[PDB]
Symmetry: C2
Subunit: 446 residues, 2 copies
């Protein structure tokens, strides 16, 4: 009568449900499942909302996604080994689908699987405690539909609440006096809000690349992006420059370590996120910066201090969807008794070996290869379909080259699926001109 | 060795500490105090921040206040009976001080009292449980300076976390397609962000009045405000009209029940707040809409289901600072044994009588007079200095008339202090021209 709690119904929660459902379909007897989700529908980040800051129930808004967002890597690198792009759409499609298209895809797997019935939507997880005496977890949640706080007992808990939602938002001198809008990447919604405007983007990783690109694409007057350590280093459009870092601000201007300075309408902090778990105490709470190998997680997923608690997708992401699968399948097999955990000492020693290797990594290539090795090790222990990881590494490599070649057109290239073998078609419209981000617009043919 | 927890160091928390400190100064022996505050300094709403949505630790941003905010009622109606405006500033000042000026004042009382030492700043209250077996509260908090979650036992808890922070944010058809900024009043920061723009304000209470006024004052091209029930009904500037309710929106336009419609750059939801206490379970959690008499609070402050738990300032606010005092002094005397509570049945019957009367109220005059009667009933039970409530009522009445006379110049009038008798000077600058909101600018003379 063993009972499991899954926190969150994004890709990771969906993957954990899907892993149990698959074991059950092959005839295994599975635990009882309850998955709690604070939004009204599944998909995690991929469920777009116009809302900003706090949602209609007062929970922090979860999604950081914006209008016009498109896959940032090759779809071929994030394809499910058990539910192909061919199966879901019935036809080839280009390699960088818009948000709505990938949303549709991940829902499709879990619609086929019938796992929606396990999910209590509109329910925020408030608190998870472990009771020593009974060896079980009390999960306290708030049901916003009924406006009730209640709690329930579980034998295992799988946490899938992500780490790209709680913004890291550093302060800069003068922000209290600046007259334009200051916002974090997290609150970016429609690029059209910045048409004909000068937009400062603080930071130099994916958010900066892509939020700049959208502002450019939808007609901002000018873009300044500044970096803390090293410049992003791509060849930008003519109305976009990189400066060394922002140092202060006044009523209208920004000042850089350059010595330069200029008039700026809006500042967008593209400074990343914190791992933040307001519902866990120190006995259960993961503390880490964003990285390929957070400590304290055996095989990157079992909580070393209480191996009945698990974390999915808490690593930085080169791979994503099929990493979460590998992780969710491993957790499932641990929970189900198919893969007994070693002692605490051996877990720590294993994790340390993973951390030593992580610290070796210099180049982007070495990094996704490392995540690949990690994933390889996971999928080899479970009935998760194996797939060509070295060939996925190669596809990441091409993608890197395409971005270096030209940062504004990398989305116009195509790659071959490592599940099906088929090469993807070019898209009916080049990126810069595809102004409509809808599923409908992308799947027809204008 | 009796121990009290005070949740929040805004005006209410500050009042609660001040109430204890005064009893102690007069020679009483007081309980031990710990006050928890998630911000880095005291003042509550009055502590301005440029931050929006979630703060640097990932907590919801608390303050709803914006640049250029000024007192919305006569300072004479919110004067402390035990720490006058004369005492704090050393000289007369006008009747509608800017935010920074009132912040300075409320901090002044609590700096004089030396109560800062009781407060653990940068600490978010996560959870408050009541243990039946020991009859005490476990308060769990997260210290963001040390990044540690810990908990502590208390005999009484006073909740002062406010109810104008978690926004009520209704959805309107088309919001997911609109191309400008959508925001709640709560996120409104610098009016200059809307200079030369058309701004729709949804709502018809104080937020709508005042945010519109600031947008106007700082040079917005045009203002549309729309109402759900009745229009605000003031004579607005020429570039500002009131329409019946908003019904939908597309890429660039708003459509109203008017039948009318127009191009709009930014939508500001001025639709109020919810009472939200994510750190309480249903045994302790107050559930109410914003009103003069929330139910379940004996004398408006003692939690009827567990009278060792208290709420300060959870009523809607005509009076404010000296209401919180009256309430804090009452809670103090209850906690200290000077005012024993009646049985549960009598509390309920008393609360019912207050509710019946609340439901009687029609006119704005009847409403603040009701709050005044409530405050009268409180201050008569404690050593809180009594003061002229009927004369404060009269002052509110004048203020109402000044607003109806001209909504854009009500802040240029002056009233007499009910603590000192002295009439307040006119201000060195009329409202529409005082563009600088700083303490310094308001307290010197230009
Ligand atoms: C702007 C942005 C763009 C991205 N684009 C890509 C991309 O193009 N390609 C790619 O591979 N990856 C991308 N990512 C990476 C992203 O992390 C993954 O794609 C994927 O969404 C990870 O999903 P997850 O389920 O682990 O967490 P999430 O997707 O964040 O979902 C977590 C779920 O947990 C829920 N939750 C959180 N707290 C609670 C609580 N208290 N109670 C109940 N429920 C809770 C949330 O509501 C949410 O549904 C992007 C990330 C961001 C932020
Ligand atoms: C925009 C705006 C303008 C206003 N203008 C006026 C005015 O001009 N005149 C007037 O009389 N009234 C005004 N008010 C009314 C306001 O409610 C009172 O003036 C007063 O600030 C109420 O104080 P409070 O201490 O009860 O709550 P607050 O002032 O809101 O302070 C609550 C405190 O609780 C803390 N807190 C909340 N949650 C936690 C947690 N979980 N853990 C730790 N700490 C927590 C917050 O950090 C905050 O410091 C205004 C309100 C708003 C929103
Ligand atoms: N579809 C898309 O294209 C898309 C868009 C956004 C996000 N994402 C996803 O989200 C993940 C990362 O998002 P992210 O770019 O927001 O965070 P991130 O990858 O951790 O990058 C954080 C960035 O902010 C900078 N930064 C931090 N503090 C700073 C400071 N005080 N001053 C100046 N700069 C500062 C960092 O500077 P330093 O470099 O000096 O450390 C770094 O460039 C990616 O793995 C991707 O999956 C995808
Ligand atoms: N210094 C200042 O001037 C200042 C500024 C802001 C706030 N404050 C303080 O904050 C308190 C109130 O702030 P508030 O005005 O934001 O909230 P509020 O007083 O409760 O008013 C809520 C408003 O939003 C409207 N509304 C709610 N739902 C709506 C919907 N679905 N569609 C359209 N309109 C809708 C309500 O409509 P209905 O009228 O139909 O009920 C009402 O006008 C005041 O007591 C004051 O202390 C002061």
């Amino acid at each position: 009568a063993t009972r499991i709690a899954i926190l969150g119904a994004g890709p990771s929660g969906m993957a954990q449900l899907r892993a149990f459902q698959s074991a059950q379909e092959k005839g295994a007897e599975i635990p009882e499942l309850v998955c709690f989700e604070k939004q009204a529908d599944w998909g995690g980040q991929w469920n777009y909302t116009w809302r900003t800051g706090l949602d209609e129930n007062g929970e922090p808004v979860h999604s950081s996604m914006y209008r016009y967002l498109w896959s940032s890597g090759p779809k071929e690198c994030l394809e499910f080994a058990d539910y192909t792009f061919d199966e879901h759409f019935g036809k080839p499609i280009a390699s960088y689908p818009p948000r709505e298209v990938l949303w549709d895809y991940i829902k499709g797997r879990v619609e086929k699987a019938g796992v929606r019935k396990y999910i209590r939507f509109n329910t925020a997880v408030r608190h998870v405690e472990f009771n020593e005496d009974s060896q079980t977890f009390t999960v306290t949640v708030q049901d916003h539909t009924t406006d009730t706080i209640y709690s329930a007992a579980f034998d295992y808990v799988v946490c899938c609440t992500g780490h790209f939602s709680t913004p890291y938002v550093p302060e800069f001198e003068g922000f209290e006096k600046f007259g334009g809008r200051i916002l974090h990447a997290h609150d970016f919604r429609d690029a059209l809000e910045f048409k004909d405007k000068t937009v400062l983007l603080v930071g130099s990783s994916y958010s900066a690349e892509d939020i700049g690109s959208q502002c450019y694409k939808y007609g901002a007057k000018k873009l300044i992006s500044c970096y803390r350590t090293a410049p992003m280093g791509y060849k930008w459009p003519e109305n976009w420059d990189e400066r060394p870092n922002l140092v202060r601000v006044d009523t209208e201007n920004a000042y850089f370590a350059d010595g330069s300075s200029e008039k700026v309408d809006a500042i967008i902090l593209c400074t990343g996120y914190i791992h933040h778990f307001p519902f866990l105490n120190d006995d259960l709470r993961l503390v880490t910066n964003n990285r390929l190998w957070p400590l304290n997680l055996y095989k990157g997923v079992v909580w070393e201090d209480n191996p009945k608690f698990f974390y999915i997708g808490m690593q930085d992401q080169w791979y994503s969807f099929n990493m979460f699968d590998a992780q969710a399948w491993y957790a499932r097999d641990v929970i189900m008794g198919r893969l007994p955990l070693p002692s605490k000492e051996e877990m720590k020693a294993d994790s340390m070996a993973w951390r030593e290797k992580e610290l070796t990594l210099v180049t982007a290539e070495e990094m996704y290869t490392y995540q690949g090795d990690y994933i390889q090790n996971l999928i080899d222990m479970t009935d998760y379909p194996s797939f060509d990881i070295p060939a996925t590494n190669k596809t990441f490599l091409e993608w890197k080259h395409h971005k270096k070649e030209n940062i504004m057109t990398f989305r116009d290239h195509s790659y071959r699926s490592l599940m099906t073998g088929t090469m993807a078609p070019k898209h009916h419209t080049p990126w810069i001109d595809a102004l409509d981000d809808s599923l409908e617009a992308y799947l027809s043919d204008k």
